[PDB]
A paper describes a structure:
Integrins are heterodimeric adhesion receptors that transmit outside-in as well as inside-out signals across the cell membrane. Ligands of αI-less integrins such as α[name]β3 bind to a groove located in the interface between the α- and β-subunits. When activated, the ectodomain of α[name]β3 undergoes large-scale structural reshaping to an extended conformation with an open headpiece and binds with high affinity to the two distal ends of a fibrinogen dimer, causing platelets to form tight aggregates. Within fibrinogen, α[name]β3 binds not to RGD, but to a 400HHLGGAKQAGDV411 sequence at the C terminus of the γ subunit.
Some α[name]β3 antagonists have two carboxyl groups, such as Ro-435054 (22). To test whether the second carboxyl group would orient similarly to the α-carboxyl group of KQAGDV and AGDV, we soaked Ro-435054 into crystals. However, crystals were preserved when we soaked them with 1 mm Ro-435054 for 2 h in Mg2+/Ca2+. The compound bound to both α[name]β3 molecules in the asymmetric unit and induced shape-shifting to states 6 and 3. Density for Ro-435054 was well defined; however, electron densities for ADMIDAS Ca2+ ions in both molecules were very weak, and ADMIDAS Ca2+ ions were therefore omitted during refinement. Ro-435054 is a 4-residue peptidomimetic, with an N-terminal amidinobenzoyl, a β-alanine, an l-Asp, and a C-terminal l-Phe. One of the nitrogens in its N-terminal benzamidine overlaps with the ϵ-amino group of the Lys side chain of KQAGDV. Most importantly, the side chain carboxyl of the Asp residue and the α-carboxyl groups of the Phe residue of Ro-435054 align very well with those of the Asp and Val residues of γC dodecapeptide and AGDV. Most interestingly, the C-terminal Phe residue of Ro-435054 adopts an identical orientation to the Val of KQAGDV and AGDV and thus may be considered a fibrinogen-mimetic. The dicarboxylate α[name]β3 antagonist Ro-435054 binds the high-affinity state of α[name]β3 ∼100-fold better (KD = 6 nm) than the low-affinity state (KD = 580 nm).
Residue numbers in the entry:
A (entry chain A): 1 to 454
B (entry chain B): 1 to 466
Write the structure that this text describes.
Amino acid sequence: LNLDPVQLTFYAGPNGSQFGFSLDFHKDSHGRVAIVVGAPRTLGPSQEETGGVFLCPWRAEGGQCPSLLFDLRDETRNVGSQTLQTFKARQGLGASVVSWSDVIVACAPWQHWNVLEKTEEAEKTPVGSCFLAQPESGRRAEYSPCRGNTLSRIYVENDFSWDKRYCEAGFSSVVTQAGELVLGAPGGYYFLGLLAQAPVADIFSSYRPGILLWHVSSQSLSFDSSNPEYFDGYWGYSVAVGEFDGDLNTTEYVVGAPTWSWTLGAVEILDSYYQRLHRLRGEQMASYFGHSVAVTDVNGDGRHDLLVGAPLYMESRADRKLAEVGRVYLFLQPRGPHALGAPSLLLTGTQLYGRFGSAIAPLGDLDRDGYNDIAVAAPYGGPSGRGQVLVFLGQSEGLRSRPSQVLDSPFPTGSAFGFSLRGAVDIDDNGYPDLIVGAYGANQVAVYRAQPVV
Amino acid sequence: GPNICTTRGVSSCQQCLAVSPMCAWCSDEALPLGSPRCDLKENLLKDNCAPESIEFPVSEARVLEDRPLSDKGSGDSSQVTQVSPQRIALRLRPDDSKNFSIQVRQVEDYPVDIYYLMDLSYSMKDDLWSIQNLGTKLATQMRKLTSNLRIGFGAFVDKPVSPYMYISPPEALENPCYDMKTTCLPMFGYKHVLTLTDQVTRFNEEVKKQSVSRNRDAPEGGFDAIMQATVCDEKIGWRNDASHLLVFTTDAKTHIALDGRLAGIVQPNDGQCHVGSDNHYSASTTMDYPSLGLMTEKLSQKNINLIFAVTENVVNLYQNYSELIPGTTVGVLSMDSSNVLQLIVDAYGKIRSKVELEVRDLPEELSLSFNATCLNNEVIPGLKSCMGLKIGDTVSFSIEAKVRGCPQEKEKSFTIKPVGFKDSLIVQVTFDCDCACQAQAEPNSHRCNNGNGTFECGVCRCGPGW
Ligand SMILES: *[C@@H]1O[C@H](CO)[C@@H](O[C@@H]2O[C@H](CO)[C@@H](O[C@@H]3O[C@H](CO[C@H]4O[C@H](CO)[C@@H](O)[C@H](O)[C@@H]4O)[C@@H](O)[C@H](O[C@H]4O[C@H](CO)[C@@H](O)[C@H](O)[C@@H]4O)[C@@H]3O)[C@H](O)[C@H]2NC(C)=O)[C@H](O)[C@H]1NC(C)=O
Ligand SMILES: N=C(N)c1ccc(C(=O)NCCC(=O)N[C@@H](CC(=O)O)C(=O)N[C@@H](Cc2ccccc2)C(=O)O)cc1
Ligand SMILES: *[C@@H]1O[C@H](CO)[C@@H](O[C@@H]2O[C@H](CO)[C@@H](O)[C@H](O)[C@H]2NC(C)=O)[C@H](O)[C@H]1NC(C)=O
Ligand SMILES: *[C@@H]1O[C@H](CO)[C@@H](O)[C@H](O)[C@H]1NC(C)=O
Ligand SMILES: [Ca+2]
Ligand SMILES: [Ca+2]
Ligand SMILES: [Ca+2]
Ligand SMILES: [Ca+2]
Ligand SMILES: [Ca+2]
Ligand SMILES: [Mg+2]
């Protein structure tokens, strides 16, 4: 409602770097808010795409940002009569970024990995990898839970069970308030999808440079399966955390699987032990139900509610014709121990191929009426197809069926305005939560500041 | 007695006709002061109104093009008529309605294009050997139904990029089957092999030189191939006046839109042709898979009938996709594609077993109603689609147009076309709301309040500005 669409702030990065593919707010040890931005196609040392991360200080004028430097050199270690290899070429560093405390977690879902033993090999595959940084101290660490030293022959003999060679860890990410990094890996277990959890502190204290393969005893990966419903389900395309069991000492995980059960799609709520609590099933095949998930309490009963985006949902129209527009589903958590029922609300896009639901950002309380609100992106919506972000306000009964405000893309066509979102943080310290929108197609980030209500 | 035409107490000839389709207007001078000039045409002549001064438009509907339905689609330069009449002239007065008929025929011996799009992933290794004579055998079977057959061939696997593609060792790029004891082709997304031609033995010989490749993940990028085979008109070689059959065969799941992000691909599919002179899809590694809605748009745009010829283990999958892509047919494929021939013949018959009308550019104020006549002269009210038809059958529909009031523009036109058909009925509408006596009005007439008014159709109207 009260986001200022007139006086925006623009940060920008190199041309063709996809600056703004991922973003998040970041507070230093002194509470000073900044913006971390991922640029998965930034050039490395050998003039080859490797990705990069930027840490943008807050300035109402915007402008350029300094790099958050990580190691971009390929590594090699000859140990145990084997040869370990990391390949950072086109790894996509910055394809996902997230901030917790004074720590940044930038991930390269397509960093490749191989192991050589004489004439055999483990196969050069995208295990993924995440880079962790404490900017103030300069501390650095890594986390690649899917690296293995098993050879190709073994997987074949064991029928490709527990095959984490194509995890792409870091595809999606989130950090619990307790400090536990949860990575989505939609390619784990031969494209079934897995989750990988581990405390940030243990990642840092157990990491040394050059080891490549090391143990993180406190980590916890999810489990393989033989159920064909999970095949090619990309379990971990998106991830979020919340409280859905009533026990405040336990943290529950929300996981998106947009191709679960033959492209039907599903979202699953789990405990920290990956034991399934609930499962929301897609409404339409190939709609990519689960592409984006969000957790926030919208009706002000203290119980987190769940939002799921199906950007490719095809709405029904006259004369038996369908129209891809996208759709978002709202699930309100019931009082006490009960199962999440049918959707409480269906928000559907309007612009053809607009992909309404591609991103869903909790905004906090934007208008300060006591109910938290959200923002939904249509990266190719709007009358011009340039992109659109729609705001929906919370209410006692859930959300409003119509948007209170619409942000049209200030960028040219193809900017993917809204592909990434993040809100619920006050960057200018005016008492109102603000919104940052990414447009990787234009290599820019747009900051909308919330002002008092007119 | 008094009726709605008089009791309404109209002011002009235009307002008179707008009351009801039955009203009329008398523009004669010699008319009593008490007698109304807006009444039934029977009452005006009864009151000695000059016949030439009577304005009474009648809603009509006369044909302009009424070619006869062709008995054979063979021969000709596509001078084949399959819809009659092809054009009519409609005239409606306010709030009236007129009906008319249209005939549609599933012409016999109509040309056909069949493009064979085949999965050549390693899972289809034994399927290639069962279609080496398909071209000649398929010619023998379609020869019974059409004298103009053209067939072509294309193949696909998946996006040649990690993780779909094996990238180690270096030998695995040239030979994906390197770790085993066989050679297979380097991986490829989609490659056009044979343009639609009537030389069926070119199909056989091109097939006999094809071999499979090998990729990692079970779902295959066959939807990229469906898009390119649809939007690359000149390269596949679809004919303007012919049935377009796109036979899609596979034994596995398929990749869909937004899957490409597991290879670093985020760019949406633009729906444009990207098959160069090398006959390979060049946007395979840079452009995401297409969506079901975008596929439907280009399939409907190019009049392509998609046929999912998949194995038992994925029929339910593609039967559910077929429902999200109307006009699509599904058939069950044996584990070696031995029955692909009868599968096609049955699909072509099922395709031409329906006639569904479609309306384009219908004005807002116009509403249509349909009554179908399928099978043996059996009327089916409120229906605009027949089913269970056979080649050579003929159906007809009765249509009624109902206009609401009078629009601004007095001439518009819309089209009635069956789904997938070339010919169509064009309806030229003309809204007759005005009176001919308005074209001979007297602005600033001496008869109307010392020139303060206008005299038209035998009455004084207030001029502009008043
Ligand atoms: C292609 O599309 C078809 C049609 O949509 C899919 O088939 C459906 O699959 C779903 C899920 O597997 C089925 O839903 C289940 O229905 C069961 C009862 O169905 C009865 O009624 C139908 C009416 O036609 C009969 O055909 C059927 O034989 C039964 O008599 C319920 O028992 C299920 O509920 C249970 O499981 C769910 C979780 O899924 C729980 O939430 C419930 O509480 C409960 O425990 C469920 O509702 C549906 O019946 C199927 N329809 C048909 C016609 O078969 C295919 O799966 C799909 N295939 C592919 C490859 O995409
Ligand atoms: N629980 C798990 N961790 C797990 C889940 C699913 C799979 C899987 O889908 N495997 C299918 C891989 C596949 O089908 N590859 C294709 C690639 C291609 O089509 O070229 C193939 O060659 N399929 C062949 C050979 C084959 C290869 C691997 C496994 C079985 C069979 C066939 O189905 O005949 C594997 C593991
Ligand atoms: C479609 O069929 C309906 C009903 O069979 C037709 O409506 C009838 O028309 C006659 C003749 O004008 C009337 O006497 C009846 O009262 C109507 N019955 C209804 C409306 O239920 C209708 O005219 C047909 N439409 C077309 C376009 O042929
Ligand atoms: C309208 O229907 C009548 C039957 O009531 C029919 O005689 C007439 O031909 C139809 N109109 C046209 C233009 O065919
Ligand atoms: Ca809990
Ligand atoms: Ca709630
Ligand atoms: Ca609010
Ligand atoms: Ca603010
Ligand atoms: Ca594949
Ligand atoms: Mg295959």
